[PDB]
């Protein structure tokens, strides 16, 4: 559920 | 005059050699435009890499300061160094018992690596990484460390393709030294180099875990300088990008007060990759939202909703939608969400001709109204849904119906058929 | 962040 760069 | 240098360059003769070199050092470190295409077609590169193994250090220096600002240019410059063969030889000279042609290797090493991943990695593979980083324990030189820190950062730089992982991450302990510095410049590129390696799979987050470089990012947030707090705050945020568990090291650093400090920033990308790292938090388990309303960012949160240029809205959407997924375990959450004011301002966002904004509201709004439908089966309407359609929300629901994508129209569609029907 | 620098 994390957004990365 | 040119053609009499290039003479004194091809000489045998060592005063001849260092008085030439040294007229091409001055010109390749004039004040604007160094005639670097002119000195190259010469062909005085390929003598410079030779003193370069010279053992009188003054052309050494020369040559290697000649060397780096060719390399200070375009790409195509920066290759003639390369096919000239410097690189394993501003290698061998990180090891130089003089520390002027150890500071001017280093440099070069920084320029040539600096041009492109692709350079990135041929600096590497010569194995620059294992001398540098003895320099950067061992030198008490100011100007050392910081061209030390500085290349290093280079050497960590890029995504296209980032460097192999178990080849850069013996710069992590050496890092987590130099968050500790006293002088700004090494805290800057330091903080930089941390950003780049962070960027990734959680394993990479985990290895800057366990370096212990965490708490003192987390202090670094609030350093007075802003050249500072960027790159700090861009590495927090990456560390939150990883599990509950790696996120959790993040708050238990104290971060959250920090970064409800941040929202205030007087500079609009600190602002807004604060409430992309508060996003990545949000994302988490129920306690680590609630950790994030307890530290009152809620408020700010939804003032920079509306506020604040769109970039930084994008951020506060996905932090406000995040933090509604707890429903099932926690609706209070969602209740207090509610009683701050988020339901007008994610309504607001339907408009947003961001598809993925569009779906991320529409995600939120959603789980507000099965709380507002849950508190109404116990008690008779469903009190959020209410507040939706008389601030002008569920219209833009029912044109989100119009929005020819897929998961977004479709639902709109069931929000309207399940609760404004 | 400089991705290269010129020595004077």
Redesign the interface.
Same mark, same amino acid.
């Given at each position: 559920? !994390?957004? !990365?760069? | 005059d040119l053609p009499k240098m290039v003479e004194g360059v091809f000489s045998s003769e060592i005063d001849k050699q260092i008085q030439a070199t040294t007229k091409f050092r001055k010109l390749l470190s004039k004040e604007r435009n160094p005639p670097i295409e002119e000195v190259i077609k010469t062909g005085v590169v390929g003598r410079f890499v030779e003193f370069l193994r010279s053992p009188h250090t003054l052309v050494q220096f020369e040559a290697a300061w000649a060397l780096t600002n060719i390399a200070s240019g375009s790409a195509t410059q920066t290759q003639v160094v390369i096919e000239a063969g410097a690189v394993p030889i501003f290698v061998e000279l990180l090891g130089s018992p003089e520390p002027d042609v150890r500071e001017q290797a280093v440099w070069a090493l920084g320029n040539i690596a600096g041009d492109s991943p692709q350079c990135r990695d041929y600096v590497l593979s010569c194995g620059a990484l294992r001398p540098l980083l003895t320099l950067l324990g061992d030198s008490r030189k100011l100007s050392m460390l910081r061209n030390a820190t500085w290349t290093l950062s280079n050497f960590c730089r890029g995504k296209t393709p980032q460097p192999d992982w178990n080849t850069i991450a013996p710069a992590l302990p050496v890092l987590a030294k130099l968050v500790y510095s006293l002088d700004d410049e090494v805290l800057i590129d330091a903080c930089w180099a941390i950003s780049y390696l962070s960027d990734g799979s959680n394993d990479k987050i985990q290895a800057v875990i366990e370096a212990g470089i965490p708490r003192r990012l987390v202090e670094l947030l609030m350093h007075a300088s802003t050249s500072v707090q960027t790159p700090a705050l861009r590495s927090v945020g990456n560390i939150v990008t990883g599990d509950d568990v790696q996120t959790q090291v993040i708050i238990n650093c104290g971060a959250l007060p920090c970064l409800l400090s941040l929202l205030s920033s007087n500079k609009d990308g600190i602002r807004k990759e604060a409430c992309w790292t508060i996003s990545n938090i949000t994302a988490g388990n129920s306690a680590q939202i609630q950790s994030v309303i307890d530290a009152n960012i809620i408020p700010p949160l939804i003032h920079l909703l509306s506020h604040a240029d769109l970039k930084t809205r994008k951020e506060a959407c996905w932090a406000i939608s995040n933090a509604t997924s707890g429903g099932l375990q926690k609706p209070d959450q969602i209740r207090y969400l509610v009683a701050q004011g988020c339901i007008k301002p994610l309504c607001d966002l339907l408009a947003c001709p961001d598809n993925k904004i569009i779906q991320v509201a529409l995600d939120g709004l959603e789980n507000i109204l099965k709380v507002g439908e849950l508190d109404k089966n116990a008690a008779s309407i469903n009190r959020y849904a209410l507040f939706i359609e008389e601030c002008g929300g569920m219209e833009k629901i029912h044109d989100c119906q119009t929005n020819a994508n897929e998961e977004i129209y479709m639902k709109a569609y069931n929000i309207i058929e399940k609760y404004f029907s």
């Open positions: 559920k !994390k957004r !990365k760069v | -």
